[PDB]
């Protein structure tokens, strides 16, 4: 659920997952 | 050979009036900083 309007900070701090 | 990431709101991949509220005022933002 990501509102696509700008000003939504998307940094490494909001990132918790990785997969291949 | 792909990697799929995950953020707070979901998963991201590689590229192949009644609900409004009040925002903090400048004084409060200065106090927070």
């Amino acid at each position: 659920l990501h509102v696509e309007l700008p000003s939504q900070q998307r940094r490494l701090r909001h990132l918790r997952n990785i997969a291949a | 050979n792909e990697i799929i990431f995950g953020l707070n709101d979901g998963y991201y991949g590689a590229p192949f009036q009644n609900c409004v509220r009040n925002s903090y005022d400048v004084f409060s933002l200065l106090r927070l900083h």
Partner: protein, 33 residues
């Protein structure tokens, strides 16, 4: 309808700005930067 351009990063609700933000004096810019 009401057009909004910001959303709370934690609160997850659209926000309404204050006039002082649009009328930010150079003091606030210098301090926050």
């Amino acid at each position: 309808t009401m057009q909004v351009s910001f959303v709370c990063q934690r609160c997850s609700q659209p926000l309404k700005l204050d006039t002082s933000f649009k009328i930010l004096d150079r003091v606030t810019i210098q301090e926050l930067t």
